[PDB]
């Protein structure tokens, strides 16, 4: 039914530069809208639409696991078509087309904590430079799409665009138009996988250049796992639990869709504080003027006609933006620390020390944060105070917790192995005579992510094999699949084009022991396994289906090998 959304008033946040909309006329015209809007969204404002056109498994990994596909689909979460435009628009309306809560009483306290963190980072680490070309080359996804506004340049993917060097002039053109107040290439494209939003490739490279340094501060933070591999997370979870004794690990449903323009105004305020010069601050501020006023093209289908629909929102966070992870991590830390401080009655004059202590992993409160994922660690007495009322503050901000009633008290976790962080739990695994906590999740999810993405298909599989060996060797079916992947993929591929210490053809256990025990242990035989008794549930039961797959893996490896040079890794196991 034909709806005309009325947005609430905007928050006015003292001490912060407002994120005024840009002049979008040029960027809107670049999308070549044809018809006036239908208006069937409740929050997003439709500007117009045009007639469009309806928008596999890696062969190496996929064939290696094929004998297991049945048990993985039945007993695990492997789960294996393109989403129709009808379904795309239905999931946009269900999940994205929801107004953020702009108006609440928490901005002054949130600002205080953003300011404290910014002053701490500046005091200890200095201000933030734009990324260098070399840093940008390390961070790009070479397989990223170009965007409708860039499709008629025929680059294929980001990697080809990057190699051509043409982006150098385009990024400067993007910058100048943006700073004029009338950007080019500022309308988001979307694809369905959830719905991924992304600016054109030139805009994405500019974002990375300006805001990509935020990751460097996060690497210094004891509440962040930025730059650290998954094999380190369990020990961090254990260390945090040992100093506290109780954990609260709650997810927000659709975190990205709930971030307000008010929260974005705070992010911008903080990041301009960090910028290296005044022009950079203006660039960051102008990027956030774009972010807080997102325009995007989403598909739909009515009466058999496929539409490309131009929609305008307010606030929210787009997923296909490289700085998003770092900005999400910071805002998740601040909103969580704020709600905890207010709920526990920590006086505001102690908030600078509180944020320093969280950052230094000192005291008996700890956080671990990655994107929208967080675990809060507290002593039992404070955990009970937190669990019974901190949700009121996040509810006030629209940060509603997933899969629980609105005012349900938080579950207090007291067993380190029940803490979920970054979609894993962590179990103690023996390396020689020491213990390290290593990640586990449903093996169907592990295998699916290793399977669903030329010589880059082979290089991609090989990197999945190296990653699986490093992170999941303690799960027997994962170590086995990893060794099979490394036996069927050829030596000499460019893995770095596709995670530096171990991205090598000559990877050996000494590299893995260096990452986990700093080389106190050695050899294949000191790489631990989970106990046989626990090989069930999320892990593959070691029955005849597993054993037959293992039996036929050497033959399958020989059949999948082609003209390359290979080594036999399956003999490293049994
Ligand atoms: Mg969590």
DSSP 204-217: HHHHHHHHTTHHHH
- Neighbour tally for 192: CB within 10 Å: 18
- State in Å: Cα 376 to ligand 1 middle: 8
Of 491, 16, 30, give the one whose Cα is nearest residue 264.
Answer: 16
d(CA 528, CA 440): 14
- Whether the Cβ atoms of residue 365 and residue 382 lie closer than 8 Å to each other: yes
End-to-end CA distance of the chain: 62
- State in Å: Cα 395 to ligand 1 middle: 17
Q: Measure Cα distances from 114 to 263, 265, 300 in Å.
A: 10, 11, 39
Question: In this structure, are strands 373-378 and 195-198 parallel, antiparallel, or unpaired?
Answer: unpaired
Report the DSSP beta bridge partners of residue 309: 49, 298
| Reported structure resolution in angstroms | 2.1
- State in Å: Cα 373 to ligand 1 middle: 5
- State in Å: Cα 333 to ligand 1 middle: 12
- State in Å: Cα 118 to ligand 1 middle: 25
- State in Å: Cα 249 to ligand 1 middle: 4
- State in Å: Cα 381 to ligand 1 middle: 21
- Neighbour tally for 550: CB within 10 Å: 18
- Whether the Cβ atoms of residue 204 and residue 321 lie closer than 8 Å to each other: yes
What six digits make up the tokens of 466? 């190296």
What six digits make up the tokens of 419? 């803490």
The DSSP code sequence of 364-385 is: SEEEEEETTEEEEEE-HHHHHH
Within 292-323, residue ranges assigned H as helices are: none
- Whether the Cβ atoms of residue 210 and residue 287 lie closer than 8 Å to each other: yes
d(CA 469, CA 573): 12
- Whether the Cβ atoms of residue 171 and residue 204 lie closer than 8 Å to each other: no
- State in Å: Cα 458 to ligand 1 middle: 33
Give kind and range of the element (H or E) at residue 301.
strand 295-302
d(CA 367, CA 240): 8
Tokens 């022991």: give the residue.
513
Helix (H, G, I), strand (E, B) or coil at 128: strand
Helix (H, G, I), strand (E, B) or coil at 417: helix
Question: In this structure, are strands 195-198 and 189-192 parallel, antiparallel, or unpaired?
Answer: antiparallel
DSSP state for residue 193 in the 8-state scheme? -
Length of the chain: 574
- State in Å: Cα 142 to ligand 1 middle: 30
- Alpha-carbon dihedral 59, 63, 66, 67, rounded to 10 degrees: 180
- State in Å: Cα 415 to ligand 1 middle: 14
Helix (H, G, I), strand (E, B) or coil at 140: coil
- Whether the Cβ atoms of residue 431 and residue 521 lie closer than 8 Å to each other: yes
- State in Å: Cα 92 to ligand 1 middle: 25
Of 262, 264, 282, 149, give the one whose Cα is nearest residue 210.
Answer: 282
- State in Å: Cα 375 to ligand 1 middle: 5
For the chain, percent helix, then strand, then coil, each to nearest 5? 50, 15, 40
Phi, psi of 301 (to 5 degrees): -145, 130
d(CA 187, CA 203): 10
Q: What are the start-end ranges of the E strands in 406-500?
A: 425-431, 434-440
- State in Å: Cα 401 to ligand 1 middle: 11
- State in Å: Cα 332 to ligand 1 middle: 11
- State in Å: Cα 134 to ligand 1 middle: 33
* Cβ-Cβ contacts under 8 Å for 163 (sequence gap 6 or more): none
- State in Å: Cα 107 to ligand 1 middle: 24
- State in Å: Cα 251 to ligand 1 middle: 6
- State in Å: Cα 544 to ligand 1 middle: 35
- State in Å: Cα 541 to ligand 1 middle: 27
* Cβ-Cβ contacts under 8 Å for 132 (sequence gap 6 or more): none
Report the DSSP beta bridge partners of residue 436: 429
Give kind and range of the element (H or E) at residue 441.
none
- State in Å: Cα 507 to ligand 1 middle: 32
* Cβ-Cβ contacts under 8 Å for 376 (sequence gap 6 or more): 247, 248, 249, 336, 340, 365, 366, 367, 386
DSSP state for residue 551 in the 8-state scheme? H
- State in Å: Cα 252 to ligand 1 middle: 9
Half-sphere exposure (Cβ direction) of 47: Cα atoms closer than 13 Å: 19
* Cβ-Cβ contacts under 8 Å for 180 (sequence gap 6 or more): none
- State in Å: Cα 247 to ligand 1 middle: 10
Give kind and range of the element (H or E) at residue 241.
helix 233-242
- Whether the Cβ atoms of residue 364 and residue 243 lie closer than 8 Å to each other: yes
- State in Å: Cα 420 to ligand 1 middle: 5
Report the DSSP beta bridge partners of residue 51: 307
The DSSP code sequence of 238-266 is: HHHHHTTSEEE--PBTTHHHH--HHHHHH
d(CA 437, CA 431): 10
d(CA 236, CA 368): 8
Q: Measure Cα distances from 325 to 214, 224, 296 in Å.
A: 9, 11, 20
């Amino acid at each position: 039914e034909r709806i005309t959304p009325e947005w609430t008033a905007e928050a006015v946040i003292e001490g912060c530069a407002p994120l005024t909309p840009l002049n979008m006329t040029r960027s809107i015209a670049e999308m070549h809208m044809e018809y006036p809007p239908l208006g069937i969204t409740r929050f997003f404002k439709e500007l117009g639409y045009k007639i469009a056109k309806k928008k596999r498994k890696n062969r190496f990994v996929g064939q290696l696991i094929e004998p297991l596909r049945r048990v993985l689909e039945r007993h695990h979460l492997f789960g294996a078509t393109s989403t129709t435009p009808r379904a795309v628009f239905n999931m946009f309306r269900s999940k994205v087309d929801r107004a953020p809560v702009e108006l609440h009483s928490h901005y002054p306290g949130l600002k205080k904590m953003y300011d404290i963190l910014a002053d701490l980072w500046l005091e200890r680490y200095g201000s933030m430079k734009r990324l260098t070309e070399e840093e940008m080359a390390s961070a790009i996804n070479r397989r990223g799409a170009m965007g409708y506004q860039m499709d008629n340049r025929n680059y294929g993917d980001l990697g080809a665009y990057w190699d051509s060097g043409d982006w150098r002039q385009d990024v400067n053109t993007f910058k100048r138009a943006l700073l004029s107040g009338t950007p080019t290439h500022a309308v988001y494209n979307t694809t369905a996988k959830r719905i991924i939003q992304y600016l054109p490739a030139d805009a994405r490279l500019y974002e990375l250049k300006v805001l990509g340094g935020l990751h460097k501060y996060l690497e210094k933070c004891g509440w962040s796992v930025a730059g650290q591999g998954l094999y380190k997370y369990g020990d961090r979870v254990k260390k945090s639990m040992d100093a506290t004794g109780a954990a609260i690990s709650e997810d927000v449903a659709g975190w990205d869709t709930k971030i307000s323009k008010g929260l974005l105004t705070l992010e911008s305020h903080m990041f301009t504080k960090l910028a290296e010069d005044e022009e950079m601050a203006r660039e960051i501020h102008h990027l956030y003027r774009l972010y807080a006023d997102p325009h995007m093209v989403v598909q739909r289908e009515i009466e058999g006609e496929v539409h490309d629909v131009l929609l305008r929102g307010r606030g929210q966070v787009s997923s296909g933006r490289q700085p998003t992870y770092a900005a999400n991590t910071i805002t998740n830390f601040i909103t969580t620390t704020y709600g905890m401080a207010v709920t526990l009655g920590i006086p505001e004059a102690d908030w600078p020390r509180l944020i320093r202590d969280l950052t230094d992993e000192r005291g008996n409160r700890r956080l671990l944060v990655s994107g929208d994922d967080k675990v809060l660690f507290l002593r039992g007495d404070e955990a009970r105070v937190y669990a019974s009322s901190a949700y009121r503050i996040s509810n006030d901000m629209g940060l509603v917790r997933k899969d629980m009633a609105l005012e349900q008290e938080s579950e207090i976790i007291v067993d380190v192995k029940e803490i979920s962080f970054c979609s894993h739990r962590y179990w103690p695994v023996k390396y020689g005579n020491e213990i390290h906590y290593m990640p586990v999740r449903d093996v169907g999810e592990i295998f699916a992510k290793a399977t669903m993405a030329d010589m880059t298909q082979e290089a991609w599989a090989r990197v999945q094999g190296l990653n699986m060996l490093v992170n999941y060797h303690h799960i027997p079916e994962c170590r086995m699949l990893a060794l099979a992947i490394l036996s069927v993929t050829r030596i000499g591929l460019n893995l770095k084009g596709i995670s530096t210490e171990w991205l090598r053809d000559d990877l050996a256990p000494d590299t893995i022991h260096a990452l986990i025990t700093e080389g106190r242990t050695s050899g294949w035989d000191q790489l631990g396994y989970v106990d046989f008794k626990d090989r069930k549930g999320i892990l593959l039961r070691p029955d005849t289906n597993y054993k037959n797959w293992r039996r036929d893996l050497p033959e399958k490896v020989r059949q999948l090998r082609e003209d390359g040079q290979y080594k036999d890794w399956l003999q490293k196991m049994a």
